[PDB]
Amino acid sequence: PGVLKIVKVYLAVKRRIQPGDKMAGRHGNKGVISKINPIEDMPYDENGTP
Amino acid sequence: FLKPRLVDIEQVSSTHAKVTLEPLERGFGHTLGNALRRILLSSMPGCAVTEVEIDGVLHEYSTKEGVQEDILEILLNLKGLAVRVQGKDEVILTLNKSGIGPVTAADITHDGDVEIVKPQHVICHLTDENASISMRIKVQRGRGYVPASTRRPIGRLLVDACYSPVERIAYNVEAARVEQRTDLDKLVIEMETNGTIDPEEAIRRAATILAEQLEAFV
């Protein structure tokens, strides 16, 4: 009672991974992401896949 | 001293190859290998899409009658397009398919310079005889990973750029069979490209980047 018309506007964002976002596993291991290390600096096995 | 020279560049497949530097002296093998792997992996010119303009849709999170996938799926598929241009940086393509059947990279109207190396790449699936899809894909050169956040009409949709003609680089120093001088080793470098760069040119460009960066303290 007393309102004429209402307008609802929906906003949509696309959040990505940032240092600080908590990322946990199924078993219970939790922990925030510390640093997004570049691919070349990440450890690589013998075949080359990092 | 001995100075390595390219001797054999074989291409087992269209994507991955194997470059060989035969006459490498002791010690410099691994030193060259690690640097030429990091430089190759990180900084290498490549072409990828940056902006996509569909005919009817307005924003990313909106479906389209006639296409079996959301516009987000179409954009994600378009991100992984292997396009090699020969000339200017900004080149705009055009896709026009009308009819039931999976559209591919071949449907993209090729120009005189752009040449899609993978014509079987599926973009979207049309599921009606009275459906049509038209897009204006803008492909530009670049270097590294440039997100869409750091980088105006309502129709234009922005897709993240992933300019990287290299995916997997793995080397292995093998003891060379050069009989006169012992302890010599060869550097065998395997590079898994996406189909846009040529192994010889990529190796040479990485070496030259190393050379230019070496001119600082010399």
Nearest to B53 by CA among B159, B161, B155: B155
Structure-solving method: cryo-EM
Structure's resolution in angstroms: 3.9
- Write out the H or E segment, with its range, that includes residue B123: strand B122-126
Is B169 close to A49, i.e. CB distance below 8 A? no
Is A40 close to B190, i.e. CB distance below 8 A? no
Helices (H), chain B: 28-42, 71-79, 199-214
Contacts of B169 in chain A (CB under 8 A): 48
The SS3 of residue B69 is coil
Contacts of A9 in chain B (CB under 8 A): none
Taking the CA of residue B112 and the nearest CA in chain A, the distance in Å comes to: 35
Cβ contact B135:B97 at 8 Å: no
Left if phi > 0, otherwise alpha if psi is -120 to 50, otherwise beta: which for B48?
beta
- Topology at the third CATH level for domain B46-158: RNA Polymerase Alpha Subunit; Chain A, domain 2 (2.170.120)
Contacts of B38 in chain A (CB under 8 A): 40
Number of A/B CB contacts below 8 angstroms equals 19
Cβ contact B42:B213 at 8 Å: no
What is the token pair recorded at B109?
A: 């109207």
> What is the CB neighbour count within 10 angstroms for residue B167?
15
Interchain contact A39–B (C-beta under 8 A): yes
Residue located via tokens 């390595």: B4
